[PDB]
Amino acid sequence: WTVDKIASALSVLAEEVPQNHSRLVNFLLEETEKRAPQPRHLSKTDPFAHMKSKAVPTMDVKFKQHSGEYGKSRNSGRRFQYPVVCIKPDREPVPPYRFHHAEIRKNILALNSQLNFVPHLRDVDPNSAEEQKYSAWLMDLENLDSKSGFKIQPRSQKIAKRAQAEYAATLAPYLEPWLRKLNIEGCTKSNLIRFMASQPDSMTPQQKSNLLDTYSDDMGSPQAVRNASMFTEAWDRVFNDQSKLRRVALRDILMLDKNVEPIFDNKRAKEALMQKVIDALGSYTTLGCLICFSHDCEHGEIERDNQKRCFSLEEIGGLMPSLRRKWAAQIEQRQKTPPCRNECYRIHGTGDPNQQVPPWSENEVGTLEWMFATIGYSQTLRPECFVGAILGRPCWDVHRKLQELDLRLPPVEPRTIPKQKSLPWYDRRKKQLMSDWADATITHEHAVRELFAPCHHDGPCTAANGCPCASAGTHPVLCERFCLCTAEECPLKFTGCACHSSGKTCLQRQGRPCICVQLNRECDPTLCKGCGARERADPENAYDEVLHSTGCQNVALQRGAAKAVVLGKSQLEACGYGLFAAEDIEEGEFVIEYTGELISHDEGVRREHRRGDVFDKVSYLFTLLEQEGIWVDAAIYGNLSRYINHATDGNIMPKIMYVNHEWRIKFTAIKDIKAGEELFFNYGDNFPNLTKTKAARMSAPKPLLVPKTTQPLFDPLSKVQLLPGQPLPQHPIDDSWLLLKHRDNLQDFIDLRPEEKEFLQEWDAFILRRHISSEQYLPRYFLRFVREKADWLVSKRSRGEEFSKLVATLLARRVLPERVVIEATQVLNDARGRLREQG
Amino acid sequence: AARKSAPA
Amino acid sequence: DSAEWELPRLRTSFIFQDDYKYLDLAEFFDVKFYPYSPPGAPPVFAATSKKHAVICRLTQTTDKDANPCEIIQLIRDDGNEANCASCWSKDPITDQPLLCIAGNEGNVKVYNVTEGKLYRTLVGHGGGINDLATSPANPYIIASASDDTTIRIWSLAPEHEKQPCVCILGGEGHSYDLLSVAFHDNGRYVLSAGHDQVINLWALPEFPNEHMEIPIVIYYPHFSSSEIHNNLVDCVAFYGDLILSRACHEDTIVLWRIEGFSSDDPIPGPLDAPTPTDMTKQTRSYFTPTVSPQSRPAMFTRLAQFHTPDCGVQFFMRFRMYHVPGKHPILAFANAKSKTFFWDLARFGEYARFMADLKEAQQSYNGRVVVVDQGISLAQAQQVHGPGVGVVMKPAWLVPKMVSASPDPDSPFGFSRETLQAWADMYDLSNPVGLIKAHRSLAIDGAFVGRQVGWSPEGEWCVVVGNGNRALIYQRWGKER
Numbered sequence A: 001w002t003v004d005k006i007a008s009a010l011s012v013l014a015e016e017v018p019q020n021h022s023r024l025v026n027f028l029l030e031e032t033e034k035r036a037p038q039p040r041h042l043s044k045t046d047p048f049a050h051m052k053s054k055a056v057p058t059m060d061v062k063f064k065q066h067s068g069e070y071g072k073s074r075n076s077g078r079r080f081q082y083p084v085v086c087i088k089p090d091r092e093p094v095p096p097y098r099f100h101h102a103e104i105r106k107n108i109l110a111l112n113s114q115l116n117f118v119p120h121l122r123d124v125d126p127n128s129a130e131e132q133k134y135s136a137w138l139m140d141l142e143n144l145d146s147k148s149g150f151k152i153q154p155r156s157q158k159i160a161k162r163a164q165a166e167y168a169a170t171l172a173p174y175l176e177p178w179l180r181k182l183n184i185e186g187c188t189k190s191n192l193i194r195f196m197a198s199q200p201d202s203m204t205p206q207q208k209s210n211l212l213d214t215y216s217d218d219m220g221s222p223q224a225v226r227n228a229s230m231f232t233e234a235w236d237r238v239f240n241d242q243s244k245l246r247r248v249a250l251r252d253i254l255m256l257d258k259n260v261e262p263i264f265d266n267k268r269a270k271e272a273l274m275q276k277v278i279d280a281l282g283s284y285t286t287l288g289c290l291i292c293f294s295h296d297c298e299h300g301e302i303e304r305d306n307q308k309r310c311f312s313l314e315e316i317g318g319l320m321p322s323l324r325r326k327w328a329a330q331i332e333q334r335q336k337t338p339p340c341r342n343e344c345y346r347i348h349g350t351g352d353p354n355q356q357v358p359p360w361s362e363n364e365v366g367t368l369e370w371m372f373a374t375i376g377y378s379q380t381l382r383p384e385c386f387v388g389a390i391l392g393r394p395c396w397d398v399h400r401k402l403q404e405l406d407l408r409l410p411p412v413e414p415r416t417i418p419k420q421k422s423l424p425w426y427d428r429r430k431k432q433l434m435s436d437w438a439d440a441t442i443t444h445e446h447a448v449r450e451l452f453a454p455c456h457h458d459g460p461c462t463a464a465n466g467c468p469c470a471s472a473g474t475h476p477v478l479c480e481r482f483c484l485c486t487a488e489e490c491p492l493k494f495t496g497c498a499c500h501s502s503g504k505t506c507l508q509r510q511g512r513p514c515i516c517v518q519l520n521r522e523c524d525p526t527l528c529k530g531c532g533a534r535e536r537a538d539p540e541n542a543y544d545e546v547l548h549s550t551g552c553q554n555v556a557l558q559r560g561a562a563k564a565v566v567l568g569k570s571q572l573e574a575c576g577y578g579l580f581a582a583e584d585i586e587e588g589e590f591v592i593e594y595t596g597e598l599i600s601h602d603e604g605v606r607r608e609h610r611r612g613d614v615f616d617k618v619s620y621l622f623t624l625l626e627q628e629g630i631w632v633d634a635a636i637y638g639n640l641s642r643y644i645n646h647a648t649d650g651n652i653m654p655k656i657m658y659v660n661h662e663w664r665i666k667f668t669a670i671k672d673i674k675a676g677e678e679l680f681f682n683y684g685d686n687f688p689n690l691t692k693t694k695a696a697r698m699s700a701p702k703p704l705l706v707p708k709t710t711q712p713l714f715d716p717l718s719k720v721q722l723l724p725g726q727p728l729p730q731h732p733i734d735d736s737w738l739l740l741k742h743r744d745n746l747q748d749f750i751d752l753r754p755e756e757k758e759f760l761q762e763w764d765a766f767i768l769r770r771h772i773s774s775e776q777y778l779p780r781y782f783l784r785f786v787r788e789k790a791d792w793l794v795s796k797r798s799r800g801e802e803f804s805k806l807v808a809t810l811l812a813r814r815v816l817p818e819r820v821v822i823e824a825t826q827v828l829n830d831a832r833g834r835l836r837e838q839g
Numbered sequence B: 001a002a003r004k005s006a007p008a
Numbered sequence C: 001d002s003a004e005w006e007l008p009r010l011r012t013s014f015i016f017q018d019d020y021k022y023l024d025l026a027e028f029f030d031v032k033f034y035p036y037s038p039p040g041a042p043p044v045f046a047a048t049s050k051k052h053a054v055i056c057r058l059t060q061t062t063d064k065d066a067n068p069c070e071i072i073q074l075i076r077d078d079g080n081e082a083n084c085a086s087c088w089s090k091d092p093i094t095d096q097p098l099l100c101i102a103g104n105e106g107n108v109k110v111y112n113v114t115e116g117k118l119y120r121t122l123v124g125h126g127g128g129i130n131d132l133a134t135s136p137a138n139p140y141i142i143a144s145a146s147d148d149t150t151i152r153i154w155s156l157a158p159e160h161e162k163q164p165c166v167c168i169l170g171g172e173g174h175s176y177d178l179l180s181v182a183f184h185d186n187g188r189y190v191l192s193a194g195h196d197q198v199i200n201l202w203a204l205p206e207f208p209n210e211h212m213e214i215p216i217v218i219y220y221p222h223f224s225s226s227e228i229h230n231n232l233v234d235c236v237a238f239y240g241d242l243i244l245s246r247a248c249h250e251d252t253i254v255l256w257r258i259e260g261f262s263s264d265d266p267i268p269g270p271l272d273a274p275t276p277t278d279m280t281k282q283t284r285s286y287f288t289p290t291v292s293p294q295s296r297p298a299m300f301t302r303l304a305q306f307h308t309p310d311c312g313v314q315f316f317m318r319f320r321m322y323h324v325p326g327k328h329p330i331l332a333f334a335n336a337k338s339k340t341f342f343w344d345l346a347r348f349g350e351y352a353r354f355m356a357d358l359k360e361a362q363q364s365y366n367g368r369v370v371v372v373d374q375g376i377s378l379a380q381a382q383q384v385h386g387p388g389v390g391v392v393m394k395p396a397w398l399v400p401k402m403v404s405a406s407p408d409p410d411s412p413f414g415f416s417r418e419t420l421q422a423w424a425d426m427y428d429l430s431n432p433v434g435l436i437k438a439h440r441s442l443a444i445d446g447a448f449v450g451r452q453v454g455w456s457p458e459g460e461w462c463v464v465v466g467n468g469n470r471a472l473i474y475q476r477w478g479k480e481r
Ligand SMILES: C[S@@+](CC[C@H](N)C(=O)[O-])C[C@H]1O[C@@H](n2cnc3c(N)ncnc32)[C@H](O)[C@@H]1O
Pocket: A095, A570, A572, A575, A576, A577, A578, A617, A618, A619, A620, A642, A643, A644, A645, A646, A647, A689, A690, A691, A692
């Protein structure tokens, strides 16, 4: 056997490929011919029959006749005059738009996009100013894709790759039967892949190790390796001819093999006893949101390479710092100082001294390990009851196994951090701002704020210890809920508002003011007690007019109830749509939130020059955080606020608000608005032409019926013209497509095992619907999940194990109470108590 | 570069 | 007998006067035959210029100096709209013909052609409409493709009067102005294409026979790919479950297919559709077969490229296939350099079999093969040359000028390399990236850019329309004496 002889055999085996294609094509062509559609919906009589030749406006038609093979015109240019029937239209078109405008409840995260086509503005004359204006514009759009320092692939090779990939798809099935026919010693796909990793370089030496870990390095005898080395060279001589367009190296075929391709994925998510726990909870600690509790959400950073860095425990040191502090809090509370369905401890010890017990597997001992660690130095909560409900095993088995392995925690050092003095501008104890606070800090100034991970250091929150809250910015910023520092040890820790009133409190204009209002932020349902946001901020209590008539007036965005509004034709000259009031809006009332896609300053300019015109302009970009460079694009996704027009003396006004570590845009009434009136706001000094790196962007300063109006009003979906007096349409937000988007994202993760994905997709499907933003409502919504999916959870081994990992992470975080764990214990054993009752 | 209308 | 093999020849050609006289030029953008008339009825078609609708009746004549065409109706859309899209429909109550016309304003105008009145107007699209298509499954369903990058599905049914828009194909599936919309015969699948270079296949739900307060929005297609063509797609169509499409600067009409797609399987739900997770992937499909040795199984397959030369930078040129039970399938298309092309798809299969037999005979008889046309028996021809001479039957329409060519021209066996090559160039399908030469390529007098093609229900008439308000009528199975 030799390279020249192998390449000869391949050439004859290759002539199978074009004779096989011909067979296929002809086969499908005969098949479609046979299945030709029989014409339907035929009228019983000829409907045109009555009509005769028409030979008041009149138009010319000159006829000509042809004969023979070349179709030579038998010159008879005979023209007849025909009467025209002028049909003027009764209906006017709607104002213009681009894309289907869909409604999103809250802002959704978006991926940075590239231009993969040629935007055609209009017909340009060859060698003219119009051509030079258009061609220079496309070269400037190529410069935006290149500015990112990204994978700048020229169209010359895009077309070439496309072509090569198509050929690789063609030959791939042929490889195994061809190899099988040749029957060469050492010429097996696995061995050819073995040779691929070994002989260079288009693979990472790290990826090379992985491929050689899956397969071996073993491919001996030394003549068998000669054969594999010969075949690769022989194949490239036949199918990888460098002078050809339909070209493909053997390397490229092996690269798409099912056992090869999952090594080159680029879609990755992620005390010896403790180490095991850390690895076991990995997925939950890495993807699980600290804000909304989802493993796929609209929170987290999208890096230039479109990879997500979630707002998870890994952002604040992972499991260990958050948990070490829990144990410390637990051993300190210890100084001051329940029965279930399937047995317990007060009734049964380790069960019977000599009772036959089935052997526990590695997965079962694992569930005992991580649950004991996350509960730790507890007083009330005991793992055995819950692990019992999870593993299905009787409660006394978890006592027996716990004694068998003798579980001992790591100890926690006395973390009695010395006393620090209070800040000259902020009293965390009396909950108020004093002195030159507005100059001292930048917490309230969102336009100049730069996002950073909450501080997770063990020392004090100063510049010397390296606290970012205090040192990273131009000025210090108040420590928020996700900082590991506590209120008794750190003077920067935000503690909420001391606000309370029999009437309305936490108002824009007040004896002593509301710190939340002053800090340009809504009230925290947890920290802002007795104000009393815990009840009002809850969207389930959103239409309770007697609840909102008093108390916390600062939870407008959190209640998510917007004043009734209508879409219509704007009063302004050539403006298209405008938003109109459907009800009466009094001064100082929350109208609507500006929702859209969360994009970078960079992505915003990319979209602007992609969609925009040089021969011109419409923009739905709103700045959320000027410094960090986060913008809100309402071009496709958002709400009716996307249609509000510009006017210097508007009736409403936008304000960036900190809403539980979520920056949000709110519109408040700066005038008294009557129904049928057009809503307006001053767009800011960043939008150009407005008459009654550079991107046109709007900024901020740093039951019912169709109303009576002169202008036409349209339904946002159907675009049908609504007539006054009719019931005002209120279409509920359909999230299904967005839930689908999130389920699939998780499914596309390589380093997520099928068992993990199943629970993660089920938890997220459920939780993304509740739009949780405060930990204050997680217990409620957790109990609803453990109740609704109770039967689903008991039915599988993996589901219980996965569910416990989620429960462990939330416990370690001190975000899930003890009482909620035992209530979940009771609903799971009752769900399993009904599985045996009928199974 | 692309064109939709025919040249006269 | 051999009449099934004939292809059209130029008959009548009319130059309608300039209707768009604003200094851009007046052109006929859409030709469509009425599909609901009973069998045998003289074919009636509509021709759409920038501001007019010409309605003609064609009747076969015995005299070669007579004009079969008769303009029975001529309408003028009195507005500022420059029309280009058109489709036929029926009055849901009276069953009288309806003609849909859309242009650069964004409204679909339904005309009661027989009475010369306006039936209704379909409002909602936020840009100009470029293509209109009628559901083969339901004559009241209309699909419109607009510059607003969306597709609106409309129902002319009495239950859908207040709100005629039954469906919206939106989401992020398309990013720029749409140029083509096509229907599957089942009326459940829709093809869409345009400037963004993406070809999308959508599955429509079942629409209730009641009032719809809001249309059903479809966020994702069931198949989406921008990798079939490297340029803007202006014409897309279904041919069975197979796809035909064309792009600018490519000189081809591509016959390809979605791997795993069969209209014989159940229509997938909206939540079965592939969502775009990995952006570094320009093709996604619900249909993809699960069985494969490759981690990435091919989602589509390029089958054949119909060579349609001299188009260049010209776009908004549409092909039309004649596909009726019992007759041959004929693909017709006119280029930007005054030529009308024809392909009889029944020819490939016959050639394939002819060549396969010829190859087999050449091997079995060592090149001593005699080929005799159909019009003499095989066992009759075999007796003339006896045993030791192979005899292959050649389809009559195969004309001269892996299979070995004759050595010298006086040789009793085989065809010239030039004859075989000429044949291969028109009927060979072994190369997905090959160029199939037109089976009939008819020239046109003066500068002509083809826009739309239309076949008469019995495939006896082929009307091609274009620049300078022209229409070229081609005839087959003539009555001329
Ligand atoms: C956020 S959109 C508002 C909705 C828009 N009017 C529509 O029809 O969809 C802002 C766009 O409206 C237009 N616009 C708004 N107020 C305007 C004004 N006072 N004068 C001119 N154009 C204005 C501009 O084209 C601007 O890009």
